[PDB]
Every structure is written in structure tokens, then in C-alpha cells.
């Protein structure tokens, strides 16, 4: 029930790598997993990984294991139930096959069987 | 796992809800001089707070019950939550303060469910 | 990918459509959990239906899901004119991750 | 209608038993200083009433029973009256001074048809 | 017969167990001067000692119960007597020395085995 703002339109060129932030406000950060999910041109939508930032523990694709940096800070407490945090994404061999918009997605639940299903998700970064 | 006295504060309500017999425990025994007075009214203090407690799972029919299913219907004004967003989402904490107004309501309604439950089952018993 | 949706249907206000997602015996179904999102396009999507039928919070209960051993489907009863967008759907279980479908677009044009 | 704390006191013993939660919930909470060992006295004299009335329920086989019904025959000797001039003619007041006697008597057969019950009930699950 | 408060202390578990009620009654009301204070500290170690016994009761699905029959299986280990030389050969005082050492042990199965049995009873009515 918070906002999940994303960093800027940053446009390299194949080769390079791009480091895309998720600052996360308005519920307790540790408590959720943060995906990653992209929407290029050429195909549709594609999952990539998320990352559990209590227990520092990262799930994602094979199509992406190779590429992707996915790192998360420590929260900082607002309130008892509040906090924010902050999800880093990198991407390592980048060509013009990997150009679309970029989210990051707030997990559903704290358990059951749709722990970590992007849920909320934040406003998209346009790459290369 | 044995997490201890509140050990799932911080656990969802469907977690902790299996650990009700870890804080049932230490309620009651715990986890003229100064002391002597200061004492004696901390151990008046817990008995008071304990059968207040149980005081009210008395006429609620749950006397001797941890999990204690009852009649009354959950009033979507108290709160608006699915099941599945409640038990595997929220901690007992914030589900206190959620319901924090609501809570002498259902108080009420809890304690009359039960004389007339007792008074219908005078009646089936009268035959 | 190897999720085959409807590729597209039409539709008309009032009325309601139903959009498929099926694919081969190692993506779908009775082994798996289907997610429908709700993808405005290259926007901000919105979860509509986890775990098959469940509903997420705020969801109208127009929207509806049901799951077969063989396709998903998503039905969107009582078209309204906000519905003119891209649907997509999930396969995962709890510790995998969404292995997402190839779209399908829905008109309301009435 | 809500008649309050013993609101029902001159009212017949059928109406009564309907309100009993009403004088359930203030028997505990209520409807080195002079003042300080005058409230320190009562608040352990409210505490051990109010536990000598549960150990009755209790060893009645009546704990969290407010209607309670037993196997404890009638005897006429204790009150030879009809039961529609009790219910519907009495007061609990006048109830209690008619059976002022035979009270002490009635308390002990309830105990050991208890005492009986769950010893035979340890029989039937012998199998 | 009527043999009196821990009259059956000499006789056998069987025997002393159809005489529980006898020793239950005078657990609560028995068979700044400095008797003031004096007495005031037993009128409230008398209550505490009281209620820790019916929490444990409460705990274990028995309350209320003066025989409870539970789900924890006798481990041999334990005490590898016979039933006919338990009940019909030792006293309640013997019997409690042999079993001084897994006291505590049996009272931690009976906590968890009643939590976990009103938990399947939440399922059970979960349709
Ligand atoms: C404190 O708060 C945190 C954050 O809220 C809580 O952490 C969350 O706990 C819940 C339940 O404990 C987690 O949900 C479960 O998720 C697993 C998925 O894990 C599986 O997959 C992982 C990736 O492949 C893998 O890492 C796991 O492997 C183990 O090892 C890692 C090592 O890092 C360890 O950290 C893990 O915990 C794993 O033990 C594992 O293979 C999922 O499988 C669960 O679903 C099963 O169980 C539920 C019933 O619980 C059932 O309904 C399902 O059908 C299925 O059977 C379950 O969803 C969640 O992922 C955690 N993290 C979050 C929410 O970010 C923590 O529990 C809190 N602790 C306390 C004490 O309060
Ligand atoms: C819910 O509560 C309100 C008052 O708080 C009451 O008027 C209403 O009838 C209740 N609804 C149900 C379904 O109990
Ligand atoms: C309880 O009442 C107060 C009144 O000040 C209100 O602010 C609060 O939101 C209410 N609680 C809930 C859960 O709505
Ligand atoms: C009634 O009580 C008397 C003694 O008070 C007793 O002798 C008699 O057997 C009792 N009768 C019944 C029917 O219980
Ligand atoms: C109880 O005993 C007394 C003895 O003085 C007697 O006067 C009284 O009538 C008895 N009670 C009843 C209800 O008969
Ligand atoms: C008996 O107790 C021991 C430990 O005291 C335990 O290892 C064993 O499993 C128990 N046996 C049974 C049958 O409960
Ligand atoms: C309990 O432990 C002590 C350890 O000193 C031992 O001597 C005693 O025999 C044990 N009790 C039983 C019944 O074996």
C-alpha cells in the first residue's frame, strides 16, 4: 500500500550495463520480495528474478541468471510498520534485443502459495 | 521450531496462532519492607488481569478453549480484509490496532450469543 | 512463449468475453497456479486473479477465473468501457517464478 | 430491554435467567496508606468469592455453564411446588429463602454425581 | 464410607481415585498487624497456588475434568509396571516418587497435544 518510484530514462548502447533503483515508502520493505519484470519490443512481457530482502535470497530465471545484478539495501524504520528501502537491478551482456520498460514489483503475500507474485509494482524505466 | 514468549510477534497471524500455548504458559507465573509491598501488588496485579481474561472466555463459552469458534457473523465494517490478506499477510499487532474500536462490540455480541445458545439447549434437553 | 493465450477477442459493454491460456503438460495446469494481470500498454499492470480463482484486493467481482487440466480462463463479466487493454497470464508455483503468456487484447468498442 | 445490575431482581425467576450475564460480568470488575490497605483488602476478597463460586461449577461438571442442567432428582421435601408457580410466580429472592435448608444438601449431591459421571465415563473409553 | 481429607493417602490409586472430589474442595477454603499481614500473605499464596493448577488443566483440555483421559501414549520408559500392580498395589504417594523425574516431561506432551487437537477442530468446522 506504498509507492515503489524508479529511477530515470537512461539510454547507453549495447555492451554497457545499467543500474535501475526501486525506492521503496509506505509499507515495511523486508517483509515482501522484489521482482523484476520487463516488457520489450519483440516479445512480451518477460520475468527475470526477485529477491527476498530479509532472507538476502534471489530466485530467477535461467534466461537471465547470467546477466542480472539484483541487490537489495537494509531498511531504514519509519514506524513500527513502515520503512524504506531500496532494490538495485543490473543487466551484464546488454544488446538492443534487451530494450523495453523495466519495473520493479512488490511481492503479494508474506506466505502461502503467491509469496513473492508481483503485486504492486512501480512506474517503469525505459532502457537502451 | 520453539521461538519463545512472543517469539511470533513479528510471524503472520496464522503462525503465531499455532504458538497460543507458549504465551498461555507465562501468563500467570512469567518467563513491611519496600519490596515487600511492591511485591505483593504485582502478584494481586496478575491474578486480577488473568481471571479477567478468562472471565470473559467463560461466558463466551470458550472456557478452557485456545482456538474458540463462535456465532457471530464477521461484520465487513470491522474490516474489509479477505481471509487469505489477513491470516498470511498481517501480524496480531497489526490486526489489534485495526480492529482496535470494533473490538467492545464484538465483545457484546459474544456474550448474549451464548445465553441464548445455553437457553435453546435448556429447551432441547427438556423432553 | 510456450503459454498460448486467445491471441484476441472483441467484445461489447454489458456483455462478457473470456480469454484463454493454455500450453504444453510442463507449464500448465493442474501443476501449476495461474495469475492474471491487467497491462495498460508498457504501463503499470495490476494484478486481477492469483492462485487460479482468488481474487486480489479491490478486484470487481466481474472478473473470474477457473482452471481445467488443459487451458485457464479469464471471463470479464459486465463489460465496462475502462476494459480496452492488453491481458496477460502466469504459470508458477510457490517457489518458481511467472512464466507469462503472449497476450491477449480485448476491445469494447460499443 | 436492557434493566441493568440485578435490574431483574423483583422480576419472575424465568425472566431473570435470561439476564444472567448481566450479573456474571460485574461479580470481578464491578458495574501504605488508610485508603491504600482498605482497597487492597477488597480486591483479594472480590478475587477468592468469585473463585469459590467457579470451584462449585467446577466440581458440578458446570465450569463455564450458566444454565446447567444435572441429574440430581427434585426431592419434594426441599419445596413441594408446581413448576408453572415458580418460574412464573416467584422471584429468586423469595427462591432462596425457601430453600434456605436444604441448600447445603443439594450442593453435596451435586458433587458426587459428578464424581460418578466422569468415573464412568473413564469406563466407557476403556474400550 | 467417608474417610476424610487425604483419608485414602494410605490406600490405593484405585481407591483414592473415586475420593478426588474430597481433596478438591479444601484446596481453596481448607478442612498493618502482624497477624494481618501474615494472614493476607496466605489468602493470596492460597489463591496463586490454586490457579496454577487449573491453568495447567486449561492447558491440557481438562478443564473442569477431575479424571481427563488424554492422547499421550504411556512411554514404557517412564514406569514399565503392570496396570493391575499400579492401581491395586501403590499409593498416590509412592507413585508420584517414581515418576518424580518425567513429571515434567508428560506436562509439556499434554500442552502441545491439545493445541494441535483444537487446531484439527478449527479444520474440522472449516466447512
Ligand atoms: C519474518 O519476515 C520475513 C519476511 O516477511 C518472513 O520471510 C518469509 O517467510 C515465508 C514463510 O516462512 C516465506 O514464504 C515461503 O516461501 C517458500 C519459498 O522458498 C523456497 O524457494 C526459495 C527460492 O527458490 C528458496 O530460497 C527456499 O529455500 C530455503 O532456503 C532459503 C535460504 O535462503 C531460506 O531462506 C528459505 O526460507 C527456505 O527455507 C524455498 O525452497 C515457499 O516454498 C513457501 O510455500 C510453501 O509453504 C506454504 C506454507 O507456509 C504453503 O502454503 C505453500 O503451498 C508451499 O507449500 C512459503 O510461501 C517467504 O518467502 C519469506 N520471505 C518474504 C515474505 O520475503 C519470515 O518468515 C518472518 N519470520 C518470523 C519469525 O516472523
Ligand atoms: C454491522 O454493524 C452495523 C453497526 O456497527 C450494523 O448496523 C449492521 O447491521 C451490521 N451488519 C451485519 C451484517 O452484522
Ligand atoms: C477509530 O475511531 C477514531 C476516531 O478518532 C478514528 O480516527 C479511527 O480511524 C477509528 N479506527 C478505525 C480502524 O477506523
Ligand atoms: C428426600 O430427602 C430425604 C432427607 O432429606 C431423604 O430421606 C429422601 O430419600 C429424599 N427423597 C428423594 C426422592 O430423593
Ligand atoms: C429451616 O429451619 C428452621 C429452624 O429454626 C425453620 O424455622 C425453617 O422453617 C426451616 N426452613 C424451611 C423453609 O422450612
Ligand atoms: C520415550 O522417551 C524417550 C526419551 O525420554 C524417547 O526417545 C522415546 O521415543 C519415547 N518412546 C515412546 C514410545 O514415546
Ligand atoms: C531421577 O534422577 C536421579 C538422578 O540423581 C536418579 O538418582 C533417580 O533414580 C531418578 N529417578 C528414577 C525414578 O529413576
Known amino acids: 500500500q506504498g509507492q515503489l518510484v524508479q529511477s530515470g530514462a537512461t539510454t547507453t548502447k549495447p555492451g554497457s550495463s545499467v543500474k535501475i533503483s526501486c525506492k521503496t515508502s509506505g509499507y515495511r520493505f523486508n517483509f515482501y520480495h522484489i521482482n523484476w519484470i520487463r516488457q520489450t519490443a519483440g516479445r512480451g512481457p518477460e520475468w527475470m528474478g526477485w529477491?527476498?530482502?530479509?532472507?538476502?535470497?534471489?530466485?530467477?530465471?535461467?534466461?537471465?541468471?547470467?546477466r542480472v545484478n539484483m541487490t537489495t539495501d537494509t531498511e531504514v524504520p519509519v514506524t513500527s510498520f513502515t520503512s524504506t528501502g531500496a532494490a538495485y537491478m543490473e543487466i551484464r551482456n546488454l544488446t538492443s534485443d534487451d530494450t523495453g520498460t523495466y519495473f520493479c514489483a512488490k511481492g503479494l503475500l508474506r506466505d502461502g502459495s503467491s509469496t513473492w507474485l508481483p503485486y504492486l509494482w512501480g512506474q517503469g524505466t525505459l532502457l537502451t | 521450531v520453539f521461538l519463545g514468549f512472543l517469539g511470533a510477534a513479528g510471524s503472520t497471524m496464522g503462525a503465531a496462532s499455532m504458538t497460543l500455548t507458549v504465551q498461555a504458559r507465562n501468563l500467570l507465573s512469567g518467563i513491611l519492607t519496600v519490596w515487600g509491598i511492591k511485591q505483593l501488588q504485582a502478584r494481586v496485579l496478575a491474578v486480577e488481569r488473568y481471571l479477567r481474561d478468562q472471565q470473559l472466555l467463560g461466558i463466551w463459552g470458550c472456557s478452557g478453549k485456545l482456538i474458540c469458534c463462535t456465532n457471530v457473523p464477521w461484520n465487513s465494517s470491522w474490516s474489509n480484509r479477505n481471509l487469505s490478506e489477513i491470516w498470511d499477510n498481517m501480524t496480531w499487532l497489526q490486526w489489534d490496532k485495526e480492529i482496535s474500536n470494533y473490538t467492545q462490540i464484538i465483545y457484546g455480541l459474544l456474550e448474549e450469543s451464548q445465553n441464548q445458545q445455553e437457553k435453546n439447549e435448556q429447551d432441547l434437553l427438556a423432553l | 512463449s510456450v503459454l498460448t493465450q486467445s491471441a484476441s477477442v472483441s467484445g461489447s459493454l454489458g456483455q462478457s468475453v473470456t480469454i484463454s491460456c493454455t500450453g504444453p503438460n510442463s507449464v500448465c495446469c493442474s501443476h501449476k497456479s495461474i495469475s492474471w494481470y491487467q497491462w495498460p500498454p508498457g504501463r503499470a499492470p495490476t494484478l486481477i486473479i492469483y492462485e487460479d480463482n482468488e481474487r486480489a484486493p479491490g478486484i470487481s467481482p466481474r472478473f473470474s477465473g477457473y482452471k481445467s487440466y488443459w487451458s485457464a480462463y479469464l471471463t470479464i463479466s459486465d463489460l465496462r468501457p475502462e476494459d480496452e487493454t492488453t491481458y496477460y497470464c502466469c504459470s508458477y508455483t510457490h517457489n518458481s517464478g511467472c512464466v507469462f503468456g503472449t497476450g491477449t487484447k480485448v476491445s469494447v468498442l460499443g | 430491554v436492557f434493566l441493568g445490575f440485578l435490574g431483574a431482581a423483583g422480576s419472575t425467576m424465568g425472566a431473570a435467567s435470561m439476564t444472567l450475564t448481566v450479573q456474571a460480568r460485574n461479580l470481578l470488575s464491578g458495574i501504605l496508606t488508610v485508603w491504600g490497605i482498605k482497597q487492597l483488602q477488597a480486591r483479594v476478597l472480590a478475587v477468592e468469592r468469585y473463585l469459590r463460586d467457579q470451584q462449585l461449577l467446577g466440581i458440578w461438571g458446570c465450569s463455564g455453564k450458566l444454565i446447567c442442567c444435572t441429574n440430581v432428582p427434585w426431592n419434594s421435601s426441599w419445596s413441594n411446588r408446581n413448576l408453572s408457580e415458580i418460574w412464573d410466580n416467584m422471584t429468586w429472592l423469595q427462591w432462596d429463602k425457601e430453600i434456605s435448608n436444604y441448600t447445603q444438601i443439594i450442593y453435596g449431591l451435586l458433587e458426587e454425581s459428578q464424581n460418578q459421571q466422569e468415573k464412568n465415563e473413564q469406563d466407557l473409553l476403556a474400550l | 464410607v467417608f474417610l476424610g481429607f487425604l483419608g485414602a493417602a494410605g490406600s490405593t490409586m484405585g481407591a483414592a481415585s473415586m475420593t478426588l472430589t474430597v481433596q478438591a474442595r479444601n484446596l481453596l477454603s481448607g478442612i498493618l498487624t502482624v497477624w494481618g499481614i501474615k494472614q493476607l500473605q496466605a489468602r493470596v499464596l492460597a489463591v496463586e497456588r490454586y490457579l496454577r493448577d487449573q491453568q495447567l488443566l486449561g492447558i491440557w483440555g481438562c478443564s473442569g475434568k477431575l479424571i481427563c483421559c488424554t492422547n499421550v501414549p504411556w512411554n514404557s520408559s517412564w514406569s514399565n509396571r503392570n496396570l493391575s500392580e499400579i492401581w491395586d498395589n501403590m499409593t498416590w504417594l509412592q507413585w508420584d516418587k517414581e515418576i518424580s523425574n518425567y513429571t515434567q516431561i508428560i506436562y509439556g506432551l499434554l500442552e502441545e497435544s491439545q493445541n494441535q487437537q483444537e487446531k484439527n477442530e478449527q479444520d474440522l468446522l472449516a466447512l
Open positions: 529477491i527476498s530482502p530479509y532472507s538476502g535470497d534471489k530466485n530467477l530465471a535461467p534466461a537471465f541468471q547470467d
